[PDB]
């Protein structure tokens, strides 16, 4: 109980964070050195020991945490969970994902990610509309072009892949649409509207995420530093209205 | 009259919407399975029955609607009409367009689309300017390059297609402009200004649609949930001016 | 003097504008039909008469204008001048530029263009910075790569062209930078920073034009329709401060 | 002391600035003429004298400055330092960088750059997140594809280069991902999420820089011209609250 408190004070320490950071980076650097195919077996052996170590430190850390907060207190945070899964999973193939923990552990990084996650609900409808345009476009392109262009359109999967490439504008004309039009001369009537509508919609999607993510992140940075945020101008004005109701009611008296 | 009301209450139900949704998706999934060229004839036969069914359910739905609102009440909504045409047309070649009904039937999706449609008027002039730049650029490119580069510029249609590809930046240089400059060394004086002006204008077009669409959609989401929207800060301030005129007029008294 | 006034009333008419519009479009459509290389000589002859006619109507129009406003009144407008040059020039090679007159004659189109022109001053410094980055990058790329890659970098002109292509991201890697790195393995140290800095700066340029152009255009549309614009919230608030100074000064009394 | 003041008045002069500008441009134009490989040795000799001259003028300038402000006063400005290094370095290989001095010497250009530098801190976390996604993606692509695609993925450096090309969307599909999928058919499960996440994040990075840079630059342009800036609407409203507290406190009296 005094122990809990002294440990929670270690954990919530800034030096302790710096140390977990340093270990994430180290574990990351070593997984990077291990991509190098030319390494001696002793080189690889060291590196792989450096990694067992990193992972052991994380076990202690997570222990120090589940303890100083209890099972239900730790698992109350999605970040703790994420930290827990990522570390636990290594105890049972892309280990480099452990480097994501730079996000869970560094607060300003965590707040960028939380802004983005929190913005996802409010673009869900733009994303659904994009999804529907894709699905429809892919069925039509399969039926229209699948028999004459089967590597690009031969089945629904192929069509979706190709249309995604088309929406990114990558070789959409020299590589896809001009060859298509040599066999189907009006194919531009399909492809040009597809491009116009998906590029508009995907930028609508991007801009909505970003504008909202940034506003959320900024409120969170405010709360984290002063315990509150700026009131919306919206509600500042309403309050000004209140002081003017209590002046018109004191002026009638 | 009590029937009408009990049916309108079915139709406007949330369970009924969920069911029409489920049928759109089903009809959609089956039109997707039917792109698959390898299907047995019995497989295709089933799928095609699953589709007759979906379309029959939509007939009933639309019936339940034209009735519970009458001919003129139903046809008062552009969405009802859209629903009606799309379903009626199937009763007389891209049937997959029926999946658009996910937009007409799901309200938050409908509001995204309405925001976009409603924003179109206020960019009509940017779009016209883009149209004029294209038309002019295509006439000039036809006259300048049509004889030496006829696959890309040989007629007005070819020129427009090529210029659209150029504005999207797709192979504009390695694939179009460098080959053009080997014959017409100053062609960069045409193509580089075209690119600068159309990319600026089309992004002006995109940003205007999106900024307006989003503001409209957000007002509509507000009205749908509370029957009104936020007053513009603009007009909140004017009202503050009013309470200050009735305080300066009570203070002169 | 009464004539002047009755003519100025014709000119400023909405039917007269519709008629000049109709003639611009006609002249435009015919210059378009004339790109078609397959035309009979009689077909071309007609079309070319349709064009002499269009241009004659414009002479009358401009006459009706220089008269009903006098030499100095007409030439007081940049649009009148533009109209005058474009029409006069045809009386002494890209005639299709006459279609620009759709912009000079249609007011909502004119206001889009005026917004863009008026926004140019306030991005002049971002544009200059882009210009400087290009100039410097092109000198360095010429010296670094000109001897080994002379078609892309062999002189300053070649370098600028190539770098413009690189900033648009068009084949920048498969077509330019990977071949360059086969001879100069660290060339990515030049090209990747160039891309990062020019794409950031050119989007800064684009966004500044567009945000300002749109705000200006919107003020102009306001003035054109009601003779004034919205006061900036900025100055609305200052005025609110004024009414509160005359309430604190009446409250001290 | 009177000398200092009369020299500081020269230096801070508008004619003196115009003259340093003119010399930067000249030095720049000559370094440009010197890229031209065809020059006579006498042509190159002149040009190289024109450059010694330019650099001498800059020595005097910098002297006139270090003097009229003293060692610690001059070196108090990052721009003076930059000017000093750039000029001093030439006294000990990309000399064309001297043209950057157009930025240090022209104030509206300096303010664009200061806005951008000052905005960098507040996107540091978005940039770090992009850095982490890249690092992780490059380790995984090396392990997944390095043995079968070693020119693109054969080591970490190769992977990062390729992924940067992929994020710019340049030939990402016809040139990289389709060839990859012929050997590793599910590679789209890696590449398409990479593209979606990096393009979203890099645009978040770009938009944050630009929005902040522009706001900072605009405040700086305000201060430079009137010695102060616009107060944030934020704080204008708070002040309005103050005058309403001194009216409710005078109205209770
Ligand atoms: C909105 C984004 C939608 C993106 C969806 C991507 C579709 C998945 C691609 C896929 O499933 N393939 C087959 C996997 O079996 C890819 C094919 O393109 C492949 O057959 C090629 O090598 C020819
Ligand atoms: C603002 C967007 C403007 C887009 C307009 C697209 C133009 C329509 C293209 C067209 O009509 N073609 C001919 C159809 O007959 C396409 C040609 O490019 C075709 O002949 C090629 O296969 C060579
Ligand atoms: C900020 C935008 C800067 C754009 C500037 C474009 C540079 C002008 C290009 C130019 O002057 N060329 C030579 C004209 O004589 C083009 C060469 O690329 C040409 O020689 C090729 O065919 C090889
Ligand atoms: C976020 C941006 C990250 C950009 C990072 C660029 C990575 C640096 C590229 C590099 O170091 N190379 C090797 C230099 O030794 C480039 C290789 O691609 C090269 O070997 C090719 O010619 C094959
Ligand atoms: F070598 C490691 O550095 C990386 C990481 F993740 F390991 F820390 C990074 F920071 F660049 F991303
Ligand atoms: F298989 C069907 O799913 C699609 C649709 F339209 F049919 F519902 C979608 F939702 F993904 F778009
Ligand atoms: F055939 C003519 O139509 C064109 C123009 F300019 F001539 F009017 C346009 F409107 F599309 F641009
Ligand atoms: F020839 C010189 O002109 C250039 C510079 F930098 F030298 F001044 C520029 F202005 F275009 F960039």
Number of helices of chain A: 13
The distinct ligands, each listed once, are: hega-10, sevoflurane
- Relative helix content of chain A: over 70%
The CATH homologous superfamily of the domain at 2-119 in chain A is called Voltage-gated potassium channels. Chain C
Shape of chain A: flat
Rg estimate of chain A, integer Å: 27 Å
Characterize the largest beta sheet of chain A: strand count, sense, and whether it forms a barrel: none
The structural class of chain A is mainly alpha
The protein's oligomeric status is: homotetramer
Given this structure, which CATH class of the domain at 2-119 in chain A is correct?
Mainly Alpha
PDB class: membrane protein
Keywords: Voltage-Gated Sodium Channel, membrane protein
Assembly: tetrameric
Entry title: NavMs F208L bound to sevoflurane
